[PDB]
Design a binder for this molecule. Structure first.
Ligand SMILES: Nc1nc2c(c(=O)[nH]1)N[C@H]1C(S)=C(S)[C@@H](COP(=O)(O)OP(=O)(O)OC[C@H]3O[C@@H](n4cnc5c(=O)[nH]c(N)nc54)[C@H](O)[C@@H]3O)O[C@H]1N2
Ligand SMILES: Nc1nc2c(c(=O)[nH]1)N[C@H]1C(S)=C(S)[C@@H](COP(=O)(O)OP(=O)(O)OC[C@H]3O[C@@H](n4cnc5c(=O)[nH]c(N)nc54)[C@H](O)[C@@H]3O)O[C@H]1N2
Ligand code: SF4
Ligand SMILES: O=N[O-]
Ligand SMILES: [Mo]
Length: 720
C-alpha cells in the first residue's frame, strides 16, 4: 500500500526508536522501525500502532476561546486568537512586567519549538519563567551529572548495552518504560549467559524476570544500600586506585574537600549488616550486588524515576556515580553510568537547549554573567536583557499562578492538570479568575483544556518536521509525512506570529520553518561541549540520527565523552587518557551524601508507602494510547497494587474495592493483590483521567533539582 516511506522518530519514549511512516495518497497507512537507527528496525507495540493515532479524528483542529471562566469553548479564527494571545501577553507585561508571564513546555516538543519559545520569553519578554515537564522527570539526573562530572547527559551510549557484563538496573521498570531497550539488555544476557543483572526496585516487575538478583528494598533506602555497596567494594579491595587517584576528587558529608580515607571513614556508617536491617533486604544482597558490580569486566548502571522522583534525587544520582568512579567502570566500552530519560525529547529540546527557568542554551547558566552576555551577543540582544535570576521552576510556577504573580501562561504539549503532584492545590491554582491560560493541545480529552481560555490547534507529530534528541545524545530528525487536518499549524510558525504580534523584535524570530531555527541553534552550540554544528539538515535527512559532540560535517559523532581521541572536546595532546572537562581540574567527584528518606514518611496514622508508576500499554494521560483499542483491553482503568502479606492480614481480597487515603485526598480503586509490591508499599498508575491519583501525592521537591517526589508519600488502605 505505501507509495513512500518517510523517516522519523517514535513519538513516545526516550528510547528514541527511528521509524519509517508509510504513506499513500497523503494518508499514513503503515509504520515500521527504521533499520538504520539504533533500534535496528524494531518497535514496541505502542510504536507499531502509531498510525491509528496519527489518523484519529479526535483532534483539536481549530482555535477555541472560553469567553468567561467556567464557560464553553467556542470556535474563533486564527487571527482573532493570535491577536487575543499577543495583546494579553504584551499588556500583562506592560502592566506587571515580564515576570507575570510564563512558558510551560514539554520534552515532547520539537527541539526547534522549545528553542523558539525559550528565545521569545528570555530574549523577547525578559523573563526566565520558561520551564516544562522534564523538571518533573530528569531534573535530578541533570543535578547528579553536573555535580559529579560538571556536564549534563550520559558519557556513554546505548551501544554500551551490548558490552556490559553486569547491569545494575535501579529505580527503573525497563520492561514497561523502555521496552525496546529492555529487549537489547535481554538480548545481551542471551548472547552471553554469564552477564549478571541486578534489578533494584521495591516492586517485583517484569524487568526482574531477567534478573539474577532482585533487591526489593524499603522505599527511600537505596542511598544507604548504595553506600553499603561502596563499603563492600573498598572493604574487599575491589576498587580502582589507579583511576580514582588520578581522575577523582572526594567531598565529605559537609561538602568539603576530602580524600579516600575520609571516604572510607564516612562509609563505615554503612556496614552491610546495619544497612540490611534499614533496607529490609537479606545482607548477602548487598555483598552480591556490590561484588557483581566491581568484579565484572564492564558494569552499566541504568536508572529512571525511582531514583529521580525523590527529594534525595540528585544525591541518589551522585551515589550511582560514586560506584562507577570508585571502580573505574566508566569511559570504556560496556562500562558506564547511564541515566534513562523518559521523554522523547527532554534531552535535546529542553535540557540541552536550556528551556528551563535556571538555564541558557548549550550548557549555559542564567546566574553566570559571562554566559548571559554570550547569549545576548548570539541572539543580538540589548545588554542586561536576559534577567540575572532564574525564573519559576514548575512547582513554584503554578504556585505563582495561584497567587496571581503569573497572570498569563502558555501550556504546550503537556497536561499539568493530570500530572502535576498535589492536584487539589494545582487545580485551585489553575482556576485563578484573572489567569489567562493558553493551551496548545492536539487532543480534546486532555483534562487541562478544562482550565484553558485559549486553545490552539497544533500540527501533530510527523504532520511537520523537527528534531528529537533521545537519552543517548542522539539527535534524530523526523520529516513531514502528511498534512495537518483542519486548521492545525506547526507550533514553530505559531510561536513566530505570536512573538511578532506581541511586539517582539522581528530579528529575534527570523524563522520561516524549523530548518531555520535549527541552523540558528547549530550556531549557539558551536564551540561548546554540546557542539553539534556538523549536524546539518542535509545529513539528518540522510542519517538515522547523529550523536553529539559532532563539530564538523566530516565528524562521525561522539560515543565516549571525556575519552581522549574519542571525544573532540578532549584535546588530542591532553596529558591524560580521560578528561572530565566540566570540572576545573579535569577530575570527577565522589560525594559523601547523607542517606535519609522521603519528605513524607509513613507513621501510625498513615503506615504505608505509596508509589506511582508506568504500565506498558499507556502513555501518561492516555490522550494518545487511549485512541488505540488494542492498548485498552489489558488496562482500561486505574487500580491499586497491594502486597499479599499486607492484604492477608488487613482482610483484603484480590479485586476488592478499596479506599486509598493520604493527607491530601481519598480515592476508591480496585485492589490487585500480589508479590509485586514489597510488604508495606502500595502502587497506583496515573493514566486514568477519572482517577486522578496526583490528588493523593505530596509535591515536596528535591532542593537542588526541584523535582517532585512522586515516588514516595505515606498512605493507608481500607475496604470500601
Ligand atoms: N509505557 C510507558 N512507557 C513510558 C512512559 C509511559 O507513560 N508509558 N513514560 C516515559 C517517561 S516520561 C518516563 S519518566 C519513564 C519512566 O520509567 P520508569 O522510571 O522506569 O517508570 P516508573 O514505573 O515510574 O518507574 C519507577 C520505578 O521506581 C520504583 N520505586 C518506587 N520507590 C522507589 C525507591 O524509593 N527507590 C527506587 N530505586 N525505586 C523506587 C517503582 O517501584 C517503579 O518500578 O518512562 C517512559 N516510558
Ligand atoms: N504521580 C505521578 N505523576 C507523574 C509522573 C509519575 O511517575 N507519577 N511522571 C511525571 C513525568 S516523569 C512526566 S514526563 C510527566 C508527563 O506528563 P504530561 O507531559 O503532562 O503527560 P502527556 O500525556 O505526555 O502530555 C502530553 C500532552 O500533549 C498533547 N499533545 C500530543 N501531541 C501534541 C502536539 O503535536 N502538539 C501539542 N501542542 N500537544 C500535543 C497530548 O495529547 C497530551 O495531553 O508526568 C509526571 N507526572
Ligand atoms: S521503545 Fe519507546 S521509542 Fe521505541 S517503539 Fe516503543 S515507545 Fe517508541
Ligand atoms: O503509564 N502511566 O501510568
Ligand atoms: Mo518523564
Amino acid at each position: 500500500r505505501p507509495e513512500k516511506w518517510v523517516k522519523g522518530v517514535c513519538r513516545y519514549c526516550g528510547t528514541g526508536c527511528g521509524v519509517l511512516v508509510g504513506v499513500k495518497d497523503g494518508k499514513a497507512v503503515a509504520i515500521q522501525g527504521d533499520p538504520n537507527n539504533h533500534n535496528a528496525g524494531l518497535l514496541c507495540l505502542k510504536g507499531s500502532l502509531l498510525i491509528p493515532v496519527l489518523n484519529s479524528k479526535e483532534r483539536v483542529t481549530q482555535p477555541l476561546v472560553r469567553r468567561h471562566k467556567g464557560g464553553k469553548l467556542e470556535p474563533v479564527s486564527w487571527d482573532e486568537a493570535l491577536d487575543l494571545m499577543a495583546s494579553r501577553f504584551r499588556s500583562s507585561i506592560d502592566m506587571y512586567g515580564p515576570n507575570s508571564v510564563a512558558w510551560y513546555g514539554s520534552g515532547q516538543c520539537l527541539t526547534e519549538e522549545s528553542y523558539v519559545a525559550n528565545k521569545i520569553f528570555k530574549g523577547g519578554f525578559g523573563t526566565n519563567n520558561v520551564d516544562g515537564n522534564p523538571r518533573l522527570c530528569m531534573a535530578s539526573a541533570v543535578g547528579g551529572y553536573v555535580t559529579s562530572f560538571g556536564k549534563d547527559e550520559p558519557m556513554g551510549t546505548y551501544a554500551d548495552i551490548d558490552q556490559a557484563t553486569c547491569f545494575f538496573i535501579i529505580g527503573s521498570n525497563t520492561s514497561e518504560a523502555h521496552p525496546v531497550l529492555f529487549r537489547r539488555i535481554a538480548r545481551r544476557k542471551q548472547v552471553e549467559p554469564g552477564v549478571k543483572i541486578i534489578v533494584a526496585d521495591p516492586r517485583r516487575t517484569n524487568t526482574s524476570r531477567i534478573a539474577d538478583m532482585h533487591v526489593a528494598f524499603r522505599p527511600g533506602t537505596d542511598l544507604a544500600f548504595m553506600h553499603s555497596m561502596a563499603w563492600v567494594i573498598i572493604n574487599e579491595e575491589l576498587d580502582n586506585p589507579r583511576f580514582w587517584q588520578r581522575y577523582v576528587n572526594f567531598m565529605d558529608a559537609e561538602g568539603k574537600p576530602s580524600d579516600f580515607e575520609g571516604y572510607k571513614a564516612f562509609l563505615e556508617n554503612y556496614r552491610p549488616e546495619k544497612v540490611a536491617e534499614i533496607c529490609r533486604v537479606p545482607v548477602e544482597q548487598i555483598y552480591g550486588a556490590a561484588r557483581a558490580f566491581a568484579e565484572s569486566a564492564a558494569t552499566m548502571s541504568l536508572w529512571c524515576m525511582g531514583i529521580n522522583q525523590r527529594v534525595q534525587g540528585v544525591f541518589a544520582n551522585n551515589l550511582i556515580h560514586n560506584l562507577h568512579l570508585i571502580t573505574g567502570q566508566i569511559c570504556r566500552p560496556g562500562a558506564t553510568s547511564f541515566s534513562l530519560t523518559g521523554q522523547p525529547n527532554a534531552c535535546g529540546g529542553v535540557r540541552d537547549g536550556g528551556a528551563l527557568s535556571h538555564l541558557l542554551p548549550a550548557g549555559r547558566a542564567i546566574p553566570n554573567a559571562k554566559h548571559r552576555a554570550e547569549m545576548e551577543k548570539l541572539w543580538g540582544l540589548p545588554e542586561g536583557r536576559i534577567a540575572p535570576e532564574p525564573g519559576y521552576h514548575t512547582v513554584a510556577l503554578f504556585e505563582a499562578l495561584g497567587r496571581g504573580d503569573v497572570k498569563c501562561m502558555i501550556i504546550c504539549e503537556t497536561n499539568p492538570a493530570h500530572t502535576l503532584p498535589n492536584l487539589n492545590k494545582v487545580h485551585k491554582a489553575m482556576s485563578h479568575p484573572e489567569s489567562f491560560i493558553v493551551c496548545i493541545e492536539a487532543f480534546p480529552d486532555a483534562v487541562t483544556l478544562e482550565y484553558a481560555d485559549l486553545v490552539l490547534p497544533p500540527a501533530f507529530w510527523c504532520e511537520r518536521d523537527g528534531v528529537y534528541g533521545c537519552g543517548e545524545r542522539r539527535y534524530s530528525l523526523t520529516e513531514k509525512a502528511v498534512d495537518p487536518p483542519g486548521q492545525c499549524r506547526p507550533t514553530v510558525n505559531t510561536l513566530v506570529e505570536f512573538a511578532r504580534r506581541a511586539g517582539v523584535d522581528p530579528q529575534l524570530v527570523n524563522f520561516r520553518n524549523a530548518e531555520d531555527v535549527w541552523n540558528e541553534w547549530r550556531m549557539v552550540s558551536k564551540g561548546t561541549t554540546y557542539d553539534f554544528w556538523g549536524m546539518t539538515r542535509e545529513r539528518l535527512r540522510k542519517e538515522s540520527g547523529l550523536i553529539w559532540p559532532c563539530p564538523s560535517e566530516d565528524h562521525p559523532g561522539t560515543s565516549l565523552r571525556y575519552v581522549r581521541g574519542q571525544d573532540p572536546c578532549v584535546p588530542a595532546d591532553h596529558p591524560d587518557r580521560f578528561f572530565f572537562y566540566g570540572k576545573p581540574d579535569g577530575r570527577a567527584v565522589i560525594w559523601m551524601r547523607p542517606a535519609k528518606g522521603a519528605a513524607e514518611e509513613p507513621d501510625a496514622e498513615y503506615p504505608l508507602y505509596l508509589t506511582s508508576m508506568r504500565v506498558i500499554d499507556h502513555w501518561h494521560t492516555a490522550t494518545m494510547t487511549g485512541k488505540v483499542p488494542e492498548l485498552q483491553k489489558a488496562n482500561p482503568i486505574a487500580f491499586v497494587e497491594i502486597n499479599e502479606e499486607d492484604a492477608a492480614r488487613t482482610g483484603i481480597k484480590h479485586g476488592d474495592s478499596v479506599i486509598v487515603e493520604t493527607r491530601r485526598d481519598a480515592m476508591e480503586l480496585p485492589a490487585r493483590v500480589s508479590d509485586v509490591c514489597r510488604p508495606g508499599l502500595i502502587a497506583v498508575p496515573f493514566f486514568d483521567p477519572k482517577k486522578l491519583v496526583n490528588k493523593l501525592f505530596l509535591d515536596a521537591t528535591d532542593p537542588v533539582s526541584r523535582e517532585p517526589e512522586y515516588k514516595i508519600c505515606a498512605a493507608r488502605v481500607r475496604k470500601a
